[PDB]
Design a protein around this ligand. Structure first.
Ligand code: BCL
Ligand SMILES: CC[C@H]1c2cc3[nH]c4c(c3C)C(=O)[C@H](C(=O)OC)c4c3nc(cc4[nH]c(cc(n2)[C@@H]1C)c(C(C)=O)c4C)[C@@H](C)[C@@H]3CCC(=O)OC/C=C(/C)CCC[C@H](C)CCC[C@H](C)CCCC(C)C
Ligand SMILES: CC[C@H]1c2cc3[nH]c4c(c3C)C(=O)[C@H](C(=O)OC)c4c3nc(cc4[nH]c(cc(n2)[C@@H]1C)c(C(C)=O)c4C)[C@@H](C)[C@@H]3CCC(=O)OC/C=C(\C)CCC[C@H](C)CCC[C@H](C)CCCC(C)C
Ligand SMILES: CC[C@H]1c2cc3[nH]c4c(c3C)C(=O)[C@H](C(=O)OC)c4c3nc(cc4[nH]c(cc(n2)[C@@H]1C)c(C(C)=O)c4C)[C@@H](C)[C@@H]3CCC(=O)OC/C=C(\C)CCC[C@H](C)CCC[C@H](C)CCCC(C)C
Ligand SMILES: CCCCCCCC/C=C\CCCCCCCC(=O)O[C@H](COC(=O)CCCCCCCCCCCCCCCCC)COP(=O)(O)OC[C@@H](O)CO
Ligand SMILES: CCCCCCCC/C=C\CCCCCCCC(=O)O[C@H](COC(=O)CCCCCCCCCCCCCCCCC)COP(=O)(O)OC[C@@H](O)CO
Ligand SMILES: COC(C)(C)C(=O)C/C=C(\C)CC/C=C(\C)CC/C=C(\C)CCCC/C(C)=C/CCC(C)CC/C=C(/C)CCC=C(C)C
Ligand SMILES: COC(C)(C)C(=O)C/C=C(\C)CC/C=C(\C)CC/C=C(\C)CCCC/C(C)=C/CCC(C)CC/C=C(\C)CCC=C(C)C
Ligand SMILES: COC(C)(C)C(=O)C/C=C(\C)CC/C=C(\C)CC/C=C(\C)CCCC/C(C)=C/CCC(C)CC/C=C(\C)CCC=C(C)C
Ligand SMILES: COC(C)(C)C(=O)C/C=C(\C)CC/C=C(\C)CC/C=C(\C)CCCC/C(C)=C/CCC(C)CC/C=C(\C)CCC=C(C)C
Ligand SMILES: COC(C)(C)C(=O)C/C=C(\C)CC/C=C(\C)CC/C=C(\C)CCCC/C(C)=C/CC[C@H](C)CC/C=C(\C)CCC=C(C)C
Ligand SMILES: COC(C)(C)C(=O)C/C=C(\C)CC/C=C(\C)CC/C=C(\C)CCCC/C(C)=C\CCC(C)CC/C=C(\C)CCC=C(C)C
Ligand SMILES: [Fe+3]
Lengths: 255, 44, 76, 325, 273, 51, 44, 51, 44, 51, 51, 44, 51, 44
């Protein structure tokens, strides 16, 4: 086989064509991932002077189900929090912020939640997706240890109440939440725990993230039969913030 | 009667009677075939 | 009863180790004895986790469940 | 320690799901009958079945079983119909492609004719499974990403078995049907044409394979760390951004200076995986037809290293000194 | 510059060591104690690589080669030009990788997340330390490590495999290749399914998880689910890297002959006639 | 022997017809291939040899 | 009367009769074939 | 022995018949192949050598 | 008295009678076969 | 020895029958194959030896 | 000795029956094969060498 | 009365009584076989 | 002593009884196999050598 | 009384009382076996 010029043959032409195509593909891939969080801002909420080397993408529209409307991106930030109890620790950019009051109650840091829609997520038939087991026709524990009726122990070693029910996702057949009834000494009413934050044993159920005295301030659902996305985010973030804010020794260097 | 398929006795007799008449045709052609081949090339 | 299943799988692991050492005393090499040990484990330990762990406890409960399955059929 | 989410603590079972439907009436061709496996349910879903039976799937299954039995029966007959020897040498037997002297013509059944008949039945089977993957998206009213990703691998499949033998002028250039015999083909192909390390498209294919495995370790680990915020429900996170997506993005932004979105990471994954067989097939198609020695090509294009030291064991030691004598 | 939702997460605390002495950001990057150790080690390693390139005589990125010492030096230290620079760069690289993992740990602690990512990165660190520290120590000389060169570290791979005649017949290499191919097929399927659910034909509504579960039971009769697929992908990738480390550490210190001969135990089993 | 018709009160004819058809063709193709695999009964080589 | 299947005692007799008739036909054919094979090439 | 008909009150006729058919065909095929694997009883080779 | 399967005592006796009757014939056939094999080729 | 009929008060007859049906055939096949692996008791080789 | 019958107040008879059957058969097979692995106690070779 | 299995004392007595019968049968058959084997080829 | 019976107030009779049986059989088999691996204490070879 | 298990101070006494009788029997049998094997093949 011959060359076009010098040492240039068909393999070289193919290689350079792939180089050009890959450069265009990298541009497309990086531009496609900029539909959330832009334009950039500084630490005072103003638009930043630098916006980077890539321009922003054009708009796409999503047609949602069950008559929820349309979504156009990139657009305005509708999940933005309004009044955050935070304080700057420096005059410029690049330094951390300090909570003004109680970080766990104010939803800041690892306890932060995003302002999602105030409606439950639906399944294919238009029904709420997560339902307590006491109202779910045909479901039963088929494997593992059933946690209903067991006491719950906090991270500091206190018994705070008993498991009363389980909330399940019927479409995917999975347990999502555990429902806890509190003793009068540790609060009143019922609270929820996400399944990924518990360890179920033979005689107890352990939640290590928070202590007993923190169990009365867990956010509460409005209806006893359904939970919206906003409540889900606030409940999950509350438990997640305890990994750092439960004790002062969890925040300081471990060395 | 015992029917796991929901056919009746007579409907079963009708199907079988038709089925055996094709079975016999298949078996007959195959015997004329084997005979021609043994005469053409024996294997015993 | 996931705890009886794990026990049964461990008795299979132990029988496999014994199969290797026994074939080696009789004249086989390690890897030849260990292929046979792996099959003893998988066939026998599996068989025992179906049969023994499937003789679940229930006593007059077993009886009634079975006598009622014998009522499903009869009208099926 | 905290729960890690690798195994489910407690399982729940309800009525079996039969699937969604629309005006295309997918129910008419679905089998009835389901099962449940509690062993699998420790990791994923426990329900087994049902499945859809169209004509494409049935044709694919029938023609693929035919290919398997022509190969298996040829392998069995090569050994004298001895079942214990058939089992003893299973990994070593194969159905060999034709001899180079026959070109692209039809070879004797003893020397590659059964190989060509069986190759035609495997071809038909594979193209039918792809038409099924396209039809089901169309019937489900979804995108065609799965079919395109499958066609990406079918491209390298066809290059290895159909296109390159035709451009080279011999059916003898195809791959044998065997376990060990096909690995010997790989080594012999690499040796015959210089060194396949110095084929640039082989290097690009390795780049994309390494990148695809690094990305499932990163994506799987990242999604498992945000499951305490509902991060495994990805579609609703796309339609309504939550804190799981924000934390997942900020982890990588603070780690390496840039990040992705919930929807956009799947495009990255789709492209790296798809790019492996495309570059591999382009590299294979250029061998023998254009370039015959890749190491000499590298020497010509000046990316072959040079070494100063000498060759030989007696330039470094002595035979008596290596034995301890 | 910050994203639209990033300011509320930038709080103080969650460090393993250093307190607020290194608790800040440079651009998008977070620095801590392990960000200062990573910078030092990586910069020293790169500068030494380029000094070695200058002394070799070529600056071509394809042709730069820094190599380990001769086998006659054993486990001692060689002169810096005859293989000692390789040893120093190896130490620097180990330090940089460990500091990177411990920095990821602090970022995870600050964000309140799980520690899955550093644990997954530890597997890749283990495959590299097996290639440059564990196999060489067992075999008795640092000269068994691979060289630092873009096209010269492929010559090492080629020569190391033909030193056992036919490397494809290594039993643990066959397991590792299968894991690699399965991870790529599963990543392709997962990406395709999610994109096809989120991007329907023009004029149609988007789909949910029910639709995804249904398509896959219709296609192959089973669906792992939205949570199972990530567990399976992680497990496949980690199994691929672990079996790779095993395939290399048995090739040298455990087996000396060709790999096909290892299969003799199957061919002469006493059951066979 | 005269009550063999009752197999159709136990087995669905639709399934067994398809099963039979597939089984029958696959058996016939295997005999022809075994015949083709022998040195004495390969009728294509006989035509070349005989003349 | 015990029944794990759902059949009756009367129903489980005609079925056995037909099954046994088929079994005997099969066995007779097999016996004739074995006798012919033994005559053609013996093994004992 | 006059009460062997009671097996049908334990096992469902439908399943047992399918398993019996599969078992019988597989056993017959295995025995024919085993005969084909020898030198004395390979009737194709015997026909080849007797002419 | 004690039952894990639901069967009564009478049902158990009835089942065991047929089980033993069907088990003795198998042993008789095996004994005849073993005698024929021993005469054809002894092993002791 | 007259109280053995109570075994069915403990065991389910269907499971026992299935297990025994599998076990008996597996054992018979194992013995028939063990005989064929020797020189004295292989009836296929003996027939050729005395021809 | 006169009070060993209480062992059935702790152990479920079904489980122990299944386990004992499996154990006994496996022990018998292992012992027979161990005898077959020797030279003085192999009854298949003794028949060959005594005829 | 301690009973994990859910059995009464009389039921356990009956079960163990018949259980022992089977042991003593199996053991006698084993003894006869071992004696015959020892007379055939001693090992002590 | 005389108070060893209080061991059954801490340990469960059913867990102790299964573990002890497994341990005892494994130890007996191990000891027998260790004896079989020697020269002076292998009775199968002693029988052959004597006679 | 300590009782991690579901037992009393009277059930445990009886349990140990019989368990020890079986321990003595296996030990008696083992002692006789060891005495026979020492006479046949001493190790000391
Ligand atoms: C001596 C050995 C040679 C060598 C010789 C080759 C050869 C020859 C080839 C590879 C190829 C590849 N090499 Mg290389 N390679 C070497 C060393 C390496 C090393 C290393 C040392 O670490 C690595 C990482 C690799 C890796 C790779 C991959 C990147 C690439 C395969 C691409 C792909 O998509 O695979 C995945 C495989 C496929 C997509 C195959 C398609 C499968 C089809 C679609 C299956 C259809 C369905 C089926 C029929 C049904 C089955 C039954 C079902 C159950 C129903 N090579 C050395 C230098 N290499 C290939 C390539 O592309 O070269 C550029 C190739 O042909
Ligand atoms: C790369 C992915 C591979 C794959 C995976 C896959 N397929 C699967 C499964 C899995 C993991 C199943 O579990 C499921 C199954 O039940 O298989 C027996 C199945 C299946 N894939 C099938 C088809 C299929 N898959 C294909 C492809 C593939 N699927 C790939 C090889 C193809 C081809 C040619 O491309 C085909 C044609 C069927 C064999 C089966 C469809 C499921 C079905 O029909 O289930 C009916 C339900 C039942 C009652 C049967 C279940 C068996 C038991 C009696 C139920 C009780 C469960 C028990 C406790 C455990 C046993 C289950 C085991 C699978 C663990
Ligand atoms: C982008 C490149 C990657 C990739 C992707 C990829 N592969 C794919 C797809 C995609 C996107 C599919 O959609 C398609 C699929 O169905 O996936 C589930 C597939 C697929 N890739 C496959 C294989 C495969 N892919 C490979 C590679 C890769 N595929 C790359 C890593 C490789 C290798 C060598 O690394 C293999 C071996 C199949 C599982 C499947 C294609 C299915 C197909 O075409 O099947 C034809 C069927 C027959 C042969 C007929 C059936 C006959 C059988 C011999 C027996 C009966 C079937 C039974 C279910 C199996 C036996 C089990 C028993 C227990 C019953
Ligand atoms: C299952 C194991 C898979 C895996 C996992 C893995 N790797 C990871 C992660 C995970 C989960 C991360 O989180 C982490 C990351 O941040 O990714 C963006 C990372 C990462 N793995 C990377 C790459 C990488 N991973 C690879 C593979 C894999 N990693 C496996 C397939 C490969 C190859 C060869 O296949 C490469 C090249 C990095 C991009 C990244 C983070 C490493 C890093 O930045 O470390 C800090 C160090 C520096 C910035 C520079 C160090 C400079 C040295 C001092 C000098 C250089 C010397 C060197 C030895 C020369 C080599 C020359 C070669 C030509 C031979
Ligand atoms: C030659 C130059 C590199 C130096 C040489 C040595 C290293 C070589 C190896 C890898 C290079 C990776 C370097 C990436 C570092 C990025 C640093 C960063 O963070 O850069 C961002 C800008 O980057 C990005 O946005 C991502 C860039 C792509 C990432 C790498 C892709 C690897 C793809 C494929 C694998 C590559 C193998 C080759 C295939 C050959 C193919 C023929 C600033 O911030 P940003 O906010 O995101 O701005 C953007 C926007 O937002 C505007 O607003
Ligand atoms: C600490 C010690 C270092 C260790 C020493 C080891 C040496 C090697 C290691 C790392 C090298 C990467 C260094 C670059 C990182 C720059 C830091 C950074 O990114 O800083 C940003 C500033 O941006 C930039 O400086 C933009 C960088 C452009 C990237 C190029 C894009 C393609 C590139 C690649 C494509 C690859 C394809 C194939 C390749 C072949 C073909 C290239 C602050 O960002 P910001 O203020 O938040 O906002 C602003 C934001 O939007 C964007 O301006
Ligand atoms: C040569 O080099 C090598 C390494 C090989 C060596 O040999 C090195 C060796 C050493 C370094 C050896 C060191 C050895 C020791 C330190 C040994 C120590 C041993 C003990 C302390 C053993 C303790 C054993 C305890 C036992 C047997 C306790 C029995 C108790 C009971 C039977 C009573 C419990 C029962 C009841 C009823 C409790 C009452 C319950 C109520 C509810 C009241
Ligand atoms: C050498 O050794 C090897 C291994 C190579 C072998 O070759 C071994 C081979 C074997 C072991 C082979 C075994 C072969 C068999 C057991 C074969 C059996 C074959 C049959 C039972 C064939 C039956 C065919 C029956 C047919 C063709 C019947 C009917 C056909 C019809 C068209 C009937 C039509 C029916 C209608 C219309 C129904 C009417 C509908 C109504 C509603 C009334
Ligand atoms: C490995 O060792 C070697 C190679 C030596 C061997 O080959 C060893 C081989 C063996 C150990 C082989 C063992 C073989 C057997 C145990 C064989 C058994 C065979 C049978 C029991 C066959 C059974 C049945 C066959 C048939 C034809 C039965 C029935 C036919 C019917 C048509 C019944 C029809 C019934 C109806 C329609 C009922 C309808 C009635 C109503 C009332 C609705
Ligand atoms: C050389 O050494 C080696 C290792 C090679 C060996 O070969 C070692 C071999 C052994 C150690 C072998 C051991 C073998 C055994 C222990 C064998 C045991 C066999 C039996 C107990 C067989 C029992 C068979 C019983 C049968 C065939 C019963 C049949 C019953 C029926 C046909 C009727 C069933 C129907 C019923 C009950 C319906 C009634 C229903 C009602 C509702 C009344
Ligand atoms: C030489 O060295 C090596 C390692 C090679 C060896 O070979 C070592 C070998 C050993 C160490 C071997 C060890 C062997 C043993 C420990 C053997 C022990 C054997 C027994 C304890 C056997 C007991 C058997 C008793 C039986 C089978 C009991 C009962 C059976 C039945 C009664 C059946 C009937 C059941 C009914 C009716 C249920 C009753 C229910 C009612 C409700 C009444
Ligand atoms: C006998 O026992 C039974 C019955 C159980 C069996 O059936 C047993 C069967 C087996 C034991 C089977 C074993 C099979 C294997 C080990 C198979 C291995 C197969 C491969 C590794 C195959 C690789 C194939 C192909 C490769 C690597 C690349 C490309 C191929 C193609 C594109 C093929 C397509 C061919 C075409 C298009 C040419 C067709 C020709 C025309 C003229 C149109
Ligand atoms: Fe994902």
């Amino acid at each position: 086989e011959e060359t076009f010029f010098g040492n240039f043959d068909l393999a070289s032409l193919s290689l350079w064509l792939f180089y050009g195509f890959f450069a265009l593909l990298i541009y497309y891939l990086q531009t496609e991932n900029m539909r959330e969080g832009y334009p950039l801002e500084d630490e005072d909420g103003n638009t930043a002077a630098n916006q980077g080397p890539f321009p922003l993408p054009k708009e796409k529209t999503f047609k949602l189900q069950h008559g929820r409307g349309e979504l156009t991106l990139p657009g305005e930030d509708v999940q933005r929090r309004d009044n955050l109890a935070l304080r700057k620790t420096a005059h410029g950019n690049g330094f951390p912020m300090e909570p003004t009051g109680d970080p766990m109650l104010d939803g800041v840091g690892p306890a932060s939640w995003s302002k999602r829609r105030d409606v439950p997520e639906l399944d294919a038939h238009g029904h709420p997706k997560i339902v307590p087991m006491s109202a779910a026709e045909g479901f039963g524990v088929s494997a593992g240890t059933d946690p209903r009726g067991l006491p719950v122990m906090a991270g500091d070693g206190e018994i705070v109440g008993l498991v009363s029910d389980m909330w399940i996702d019927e479409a995917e057949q999975l347990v999502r939440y555990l429902e806890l009834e509190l003793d009068p000494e540790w609060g009143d009413g019922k609270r929820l725990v996400q399944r990924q934050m518990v360890r179920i044993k033979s005689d107890r159920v352990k939640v290590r993230s928070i202590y007993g005295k923190h169990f009365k301030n867990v956010p509460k659902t409005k209806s006893p039969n359904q939970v919206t996305l906003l409540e889900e985010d606030k409940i999950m973030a509350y438990y997640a913030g305890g990994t750092l804010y439960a004790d002062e020794s969890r925040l300081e260097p471990q060395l | 009667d015992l029917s796991f398929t929901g056919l009746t006795d007579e409907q079963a007799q009708e199907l079988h009677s038709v089925y055996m008449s094709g079975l016999w045709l298949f078996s007959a052609v195959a015997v004329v075939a084997h005979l021609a081949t043994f005469i053409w090339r024996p294997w015993f | 009863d996931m705890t009886c299943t794990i026990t049964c799988w461990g008795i299979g692991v132990l029988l496999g180790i014994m199969t290797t050492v026994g074939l080696m005393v009789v004249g086989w090499s390690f890897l030849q004895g260990a292929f046979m040990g792996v099959l003893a484990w998988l066939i026998v330990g599996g068989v025992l986790a179906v049969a023994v762990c499937g003789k679940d406890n229930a006593e007059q409960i077993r009886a009634e469940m079975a006598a009622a399955r014998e009522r499903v059929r009869g009208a099926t | 320690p905290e729960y890690q989410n690798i195994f489910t603590q407690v399982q729940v079972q309800g009525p079996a799901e039969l699937g969604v439907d629309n005006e295309n009436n997918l129910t008419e061709e679905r089998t009835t009958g389901t099962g449940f496996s509690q062993l699998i349910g420790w990791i994923g879903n426990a329900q087994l079945g049902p499945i859809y039976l169209g004509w494409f799937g049935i044709i694919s299954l029938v023609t693929g079983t035919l290919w398997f039995n022509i190969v298996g029966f040829n392998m069995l007959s090569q050994v004298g119909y001895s079942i214990p020897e058939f089992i003893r040498q299973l990994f070593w037997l194969a159905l060999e492609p034709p001899s180079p002297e026959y070109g692209l013509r039809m070879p004797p059944l003893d020397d590659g004719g059964w190989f060509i008949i069986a190759s035609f039945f495997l071809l038909v089977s594979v193209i039918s499974w792809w038409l099924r993957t396209y039809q089901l998206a169309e019937m489900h009213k979804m995108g065609k990403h799965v079919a395109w990703a499958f066609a990406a691998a079918i491209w390298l499949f066809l290059v290895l078995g159909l296109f390159r033998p035709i451009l080279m002028g011999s059916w003898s250039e195809a791959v044998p049907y065997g376990i060990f015999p096909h690995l010997d083909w790989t080594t012999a192909f690499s040796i015959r044409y210089g060194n396949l390390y110095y084929n640039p498209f082989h290097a690009l294919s390795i780049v994309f394979l390494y990148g695809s495995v690094l990305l499932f370790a990163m994506h799987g680990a990242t999604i498992l760390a945000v499951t305490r915020f509902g991060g495994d429900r990805e579609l609703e996170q796309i339609y309504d951004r939550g804190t799981a997506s924000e934390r997942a993005g900020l982890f990588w932004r603070w780690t390496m200076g840039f990040n992705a979105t919930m929807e956009g990471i799947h495009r990255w994954a789709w492209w790296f995986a798809v790019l492996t067989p495309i570059t591999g097939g382009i590299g294979i198609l250029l061998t023998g037809t254009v370039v015959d020695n890749w190491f000499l090509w590298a020497v010509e294009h000046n990316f072959a290293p040079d070494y100063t030291q000498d060759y030989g064991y007696e330039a470094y030691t002595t035979y008596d000194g290596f034995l301890g004598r | 510059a910050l994203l639209s939702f990033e300011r509320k997460y930038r709080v103080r605390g969650g460090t393993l060591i250093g307190g607020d002495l290194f608790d800040f950001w440079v651009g998008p990057f977070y620095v801590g104690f392990f960000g200062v150790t990573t910078a030092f080690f990586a910069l020293l390693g790169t500068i030494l690589i380029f000094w070695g390139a200058s002394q070799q005589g070529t600056f071509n990125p394809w042709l730069i080669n820094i190599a380990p010492p001769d086998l006659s030096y054993g486990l001692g230290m060689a002169p810096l030009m005859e293989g000692g620079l390789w040893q120093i760069i190896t130490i620097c690289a180990i330090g940089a990788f460990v500091s990177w993992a411990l920095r990821e740990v602090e970022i995870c602690r600050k964000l309140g997340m799980g520690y899955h990512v550093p644990f997954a990165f530890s597997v890749a660190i283990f495959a590299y330390v097996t290639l440059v520290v564990f196999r060489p120590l067992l075999m008795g000389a640092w000269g068994h490590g691979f060289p630092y060169g873009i096209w010269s570290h492929l010559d090492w791979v080629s020569n190391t495999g033909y030193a056992y005649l036919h490397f494809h017949y290594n039993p643990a290499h066959m397991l590792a290749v299968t894991f690699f191919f399965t991870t790529t097929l599963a990543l392709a399927l997962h990406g395709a399914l999610v994109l096809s659910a989120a991007n329907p034909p023009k004029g149609e509504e988007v789909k949910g998880p029910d639709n995804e579960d249904t398509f896959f039971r219709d296609f192959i009769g089973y669906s792992i689910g939205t949570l199972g697929i990530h567990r399976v992908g992680l497990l496949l990738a980690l199994n691929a890297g672990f079996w790779s480390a095993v395939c290399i550490i048995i090739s040298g210190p455990v087996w000396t002959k060709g790999w096909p001969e290892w299969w003799n135990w199957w061919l002469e089993m006493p059951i066979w006639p | 022997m005269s009550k063999f018709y009752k197999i159709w009160l136990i087995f669905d004819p639709r399934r067994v017809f398809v099963a039979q058809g597939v089984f029958l063709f696959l058996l016939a193709a295997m005999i022809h291939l075994v015949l083709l695999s022998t040195e004495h009964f390969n009728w294509f080589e006989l035509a070349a040899a005989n003349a």
